[PDB]
Design an enzyme around this catalytic site. Structure first.
Site, PDB file in Angstrom:
ATOM      1  N   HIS A   1       5.251  10.661   7.152  1.00  0.00           N
ATOM      2  CA  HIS A   1       4.992  10.272   8.530  1.00  0.00           C
ATOM      3  C   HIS A   1       6.206   9.581   9.124  1.00  0.00           C
ATOM      4  CE1 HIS A   1       0.345  10.151   7.825  1.00  0.00           C
ATOM      5  NE2 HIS A   1       0.801  11.372   8.040  1.00  0.00           N
TER       6      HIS A   1
ATOM      7  N   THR B   1      -3.449   5.784  10.813  1.00  0.00           N
ATOM      8  CA  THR B   1      -4.369   6.101   9.723  1.00  0.00           C
ATOM      9  C   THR B   1      -4.600   4.898   8.806  1.00  0.00           C
ATOM     10  OG1 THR B   1      -2.677   6.901   8.185  1.00  0.00           O
ATOM     11  CG2 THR B   1      -3.612   8.498   9.755  1.00  0.00           C
ATOM     12  N   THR B   2      -3.918   3.794   9.092  1.00  0.00           N
ATOM     13  CA  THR B   2      -4.103   2.565   8.324  1.00  0.00           C
ATOM     14  C   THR B   2      -4.493   1.488   9.316  1.00  0.00           C
ATOM     15  OG1 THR B   2      -1.896   1.618   8.675  1.00  0.00           O
ATOM     16  CG2 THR B   2      -2.164   3.118   6.804  1.00  0.00           C
TER      17      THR B   2
ATOM     18  N   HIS C   1       2.209   9.112   2.070  1.00  0.00           N
ATOM     19  CA  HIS C   1       0.873   8.883   1.528  1.00  0.00           C
ATOM     20  C   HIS C   1       0.853   9.917   0.404  1.00  0.00           C
ATOM     21  CE1 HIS C   1      -0.647   6.715   5.152  1.00  0.00           C
ATOM     22  NE2 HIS C   1       0.241   7.484   5.757  1.00  0.00           N
TER      23      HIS C   1
ATOM     24  N   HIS D   1       0.819  -1.208   0.000  1.00  0.00           N
ATOM     25  CA  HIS D   1       0.000   0.000   0.000  1.00  0.00           C
ATOM     26  C   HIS D   1       0.856   1.263   0.000  1.00  0.00           C
ATOM     27  CE1 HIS D   1       0.435  -1.156   4.297  1.00  0.00           C
ATOM     28  NE2 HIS D   1       0.577   0.141   4.498  1.00  0.00           N
TER      29      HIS D   1
ATOM     30  N   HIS E   1       7.252   6.761   6.203  1.00  0.00           N
ATOM     31  CA  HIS E   1       6.618   6.408   4.945  1.00  0.00           C
ATOM     32  C   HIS E   1       5.836   7.629   4.506  1.00  0.00           C
ATOM     33  CE1 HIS E   1       3.689   5.816   8.137  1.00  0.00           C
ATOM     34  NE2 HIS E   1       2.841   6.307   7.252  1.00  0.00           N
TER      35      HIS E   1
ATOM     36  N   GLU F   1      -3.118  13.220   4.134  1.00  0.00           N
ATOM     37  CA  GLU F   1      -4.174  12.668   4.975  1.00  0.00           C
ATOM     38  C   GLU F   1      -4.747  13.809   5.799  1.00  0.00           C
ATOM     39  OE1 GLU F   1      -2.304   8.993   6.744  1.00  0.00           O
ATOM     40  OE2 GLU F   1      -3.652   8.165   5.214  1.00  0.00           O
TER      41      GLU F   1
HETATM   42  N1  I7A Z   1       0.819   0.329   8.157  1.00  0.00           N
HETATM   43  S1  I7A Z   1       1.896   1.469   7.981  1.00  0.00           S
HETATM   44  O1  I7A Z   1       3.192   0.868   8.005  1.00  0.00           O
HETATM   45  O2  I7A Z   1       1.512   2.274   6.866  1.00  0.00           O
HETATM   46  C1  I7A Z   1       1.797   2.489   9.417  1.00  0.00           C
HETATM   47  C2  I7A Z   1       2.275   2.001  10.658  1.00  0.00           C
HETATM   48  C3  I7A Z   1       2.195   2.830  11.785  1.00  0.00           C
HETATM   49 CL1  I7A Z   1       2.768   2.250  13.296  1.00  0.00          CL
HETATM   50  C4  I7A Z   1       1.656   4.121  11.700  1.00  0.00           C
HETATM   51 CL2  I7A Z   1       1.592   5.096  13.088  1.00  0.00          CL
HETATM   52  C5  I7A Z   1       1.178   4.594  10.458  1.00  0.00           C
HETATM   53  S2  I7A Z   1       0.482   6.216  10.288  1.00  0.00           S
HETATM   54  N2  I7A Z   1      -0.089   6.396   8.836  1.00  0.00           N
HETATM   55  O3  I7A Z   1       1.585   7.099  10.472  1.00  0.00           O
HETATM   56  O4  I7A Z   1      -0.621   6.275  11.204  1.00  0.00           O
HETATM   57  C6  I7A Z   1       1.247   3.779   9.314  1.00  0.00           C
HETATM   58 ZN    ZN Z   2       1.076   7.301   7.506  1.00  0.00          ZN
END
Ligand code: I7A
Ligand code: ZN
Length: 258
Positions: free
Chosen positions: A117, A196-197, A94, A62, A92, A104
Site C-alpha cells: 500500500h 484498513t487499520t 500486509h 503491526h 507498507h 486485504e
Molecule cells: N496504520 S498504518 O500506518 O498501517 C496505515 C495508515 C494509513 Cl494513512 C493508511 Cl491509508 C493505511 S491503509 N492500510 O493503506 O489503509 C494504513
Molecule cells: Zn495497508
C-alpha cells in the site's frame, strides 16, 4: 488492550473503539472482476516517483512503514479517478503466515500472499493530518504480491528488517526508489473506501492494480521474521496483519481496462 490482529484485539473487535468499522465505505473489499464495470471516464493513471525521497523505516507494532519526505512537491500520484494531485507519504505491506493468505483486497475471492500500500494525501488539504478528515483526502495505490521470482527492488527493504525486528524500532532508510516495486501494467480497479487499520477513516480513494508483482519465498519469509512485540518481550511473529474483505454496501468498483 491496543488494537491488533489477534483473537481478542483483531478485526472483529475494532468496531468497539472504532464504530466506523461497520460503516458504509469500509475497506478492503472483494473485487468481483465480472461485476466491475469498465469506466471510459477514467483518465490515465499517473505515477511519478522519480524524485521520491525516503527518510526511514519503522516497526509500528503491526507492520512496518517506509516513510518519505513529503514537505515538497515530489513523488505524486494523479490522473485515473483522482482530481488534483496526491503526494506520497509512506508505504507498507500486509502479509500472511502462509503464502495462501495475506492480502486485504481479494480478486474473485482469491487471496494473495501479501499486499503493498502506497499512501498519498491530497495536496489541496495542506498536509496528511487534515487530509484524512476529508472524503477524498487520501489515495492508496494497492499492489498484490505473489510468491515466485524475487523482486530485486524489494531486497533493500528486506535486508533492513533485521534492524527493526521489534515494535518501536526504526532505522535510517534513505534513497529507496519505490519505482522498483511497481508491476509492468497500471491497469486497475478503483472504488471509494477507508483506511484498513484503525482509525478506519473513510477518506480513501482506492486504486488496486490488477497485475501483481512477484516476490521470492525467501523475501516474504523475512517479512514473517518481524515481531509484533517490543524488544525484550515474549516473541509474537508479525504475520497475518491483514483485515478481511468488508461489505461492498452497493458501492461500484470501476475498472480502467476492458
Ligand atoms: N496504520 S498504518 O500506518 O498501517 C496505515 C495508515 C494509513 Cl494513512 C493508511 Cl491509508 C493505511 S491503509 N492500510 O493503506 O489503509 C494504513
Ligand atoms: Zn495497508
Amino acid at each position: 488492550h491496543h488494537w491488533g490482529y489477534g483473537k481478542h484485539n483483531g478485526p472483529e473487535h475494532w468496531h468497539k473503539d472504532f464504530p466506523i468499522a461497520k460503516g458504509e465505505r469500509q475497506s478492503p473489499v472483494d473485487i468481483d472482476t465480472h461485476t466491475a464495470k469498465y469506466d471510459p471516464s477514467l483518465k490515465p493513471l499517473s505515477v511519478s516517483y522519480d524524485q521520491a525521497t525516503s527518510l526511514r523505516i519503522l516497526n509500528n507494532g503491526h507492520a512496518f512503514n517506509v516513510e518519505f519526505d513529503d514537505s515538497q512537491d515530489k513523488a505524486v500520484l494523479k490522473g485515473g479517478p483522482l482530481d488534483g494531485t496526491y503526494r506520497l507519504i509512506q508505504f507498507h505491506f500486509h502479509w500472511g503466515s502462509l503464502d495462501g493468505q495475506g492480502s486485504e483486497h481479494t480478486v474473485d475471492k482469491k487471496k494473495y500472499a501479501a499486499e503493498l500500500h502506497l499512501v498519498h494525501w491530497n495536496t489541496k488539504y495542506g498536509d496528511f493530518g487534515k487530509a484524512v478528515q476529508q472524503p477524498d483526502g487520501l489515495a492508496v495505490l494497492g499492489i498484490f504480491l505473489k510468491v515466485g521470482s524475487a523482486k530485486p527492488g524489494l531486497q533493500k527493504v528486506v535486508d533492513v528488517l533485521d534492524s527493526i525486528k521489534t515494535k518501536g524500532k526504526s532505522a535510517d532508510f534513505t534513497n529507496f526508489d519505490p519505482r522498483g516495486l511497481l508491476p509492468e501494467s497500471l491497469d486497475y480497479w478503483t472504488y471509494p473506501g477507508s483506511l484498513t487499520t484503525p482509525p478506519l477513516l473513510e477518506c480513501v480513494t482506492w486504486i488496486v492494480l490488477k497485475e501483481p508483482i512477484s516476490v521470492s519465498s525467501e523475501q516474504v519469509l523475512k517479512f514473517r521474521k518481524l515481531n509484533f512485540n517490543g524488544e525484550g518481550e515474549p516473541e509474537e511473529l508479525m504475520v497475518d496483519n491483514w483485515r478481511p474483505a468488508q461489505p461492498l454496501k452497493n458501492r461500484q468498483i470501476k475498472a480502467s481496462f476492458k
